[PDB]
Amino acid sequence: SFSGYLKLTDNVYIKNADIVEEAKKVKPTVVVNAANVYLKHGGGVAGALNKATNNAMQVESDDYIATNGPLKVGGSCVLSGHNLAKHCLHVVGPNVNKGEDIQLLKSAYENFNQHEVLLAPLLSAGIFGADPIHSLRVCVDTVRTNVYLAVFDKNLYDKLVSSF
Ligand SMILES: CC(C)[C@H](CO)Nc1ncnc2[nH]ccc12
């Protein structure tokens, strides 16, 4: 079902696309959200995915937090994918702008190994403040399952590919 991706490794693929638009087109088994520990989906990938669900992702997430408490940085939970995917894997990468340990980025990507194929963004990059070139390297060196990476910014996509 994935189309137009550039192969980077045996198991990692990349495309210049909004992950929301790719999810609407493909309806993958799993879409990854770039979540925070409170599952407050305000902006970046999380705010865009939640808006595409008409806020249903946020209502589900608030019930999850009321029952279970916050996630750990480096942790994840599986919730519904609503109209975008069968499931959403909410993964918390460290937020560099909040001073979180960047070594937790490898722990964050290890969550992907529980799923055979995923549509995903680069964890900890974008509004989370980490270097996206570093995030792509940790992804390729950590994830063993099949990952389709969507990168919205064209200038960044070209830099990620040309420096790989
Ligand atoms: C995470 C970051 C490197 C990347 C830079 O374009 N942001 C995104 N990538 C893919 N789909 C997106 N929708 C909303 C944001 C967003």
Curated annotation (Swiss-Prot):
Domain Macro per the UniProt entry, residue ranges: 1-164
Gene that specifies this protein: rep
Catalysed reactions, semicolon-separated: Thiol-dependent hydrolysis of ester, thioester, amide, peptide and isopeptide bonds formed by the C-terminal Gly of ubiquitin (a 76-residue protein attached to proteins as an intracellular targeting signal)
Regulation: Inhibited in vitro by GRL-0617.
Organism: Severe acute respiratory syndrome coronavirus 2
Cited function: Responsible for the cleavages located at the N-terminus of the replicase polyprotein. Participates together with nsp4 in the assembly of virally-induced cytoplasmic double-membrane vesicles necessary for viral replication. Antagonizes innate immune induction of type I interferon by blocking the phosphorylation, dimerization and subsequent nuclear translocation of host IRF3. Also prevents host NF-kappa-B signaling. In addition, PL-PRO possesses a deubiquitinating/deISGylating activity and processes both 'Lys-48'- and 'Lys-63'-linked polyubiquitin chains from cellular substrates.
Recorded superkingdom: Viruses
Topological category with respect to the lipid bilayer: Multi-pass membrane protein
Subcellular location(s) per record: Host endoplasmic reticulum membrane
Protein's name according to its UniProt entry: Papain-like protease nsp3
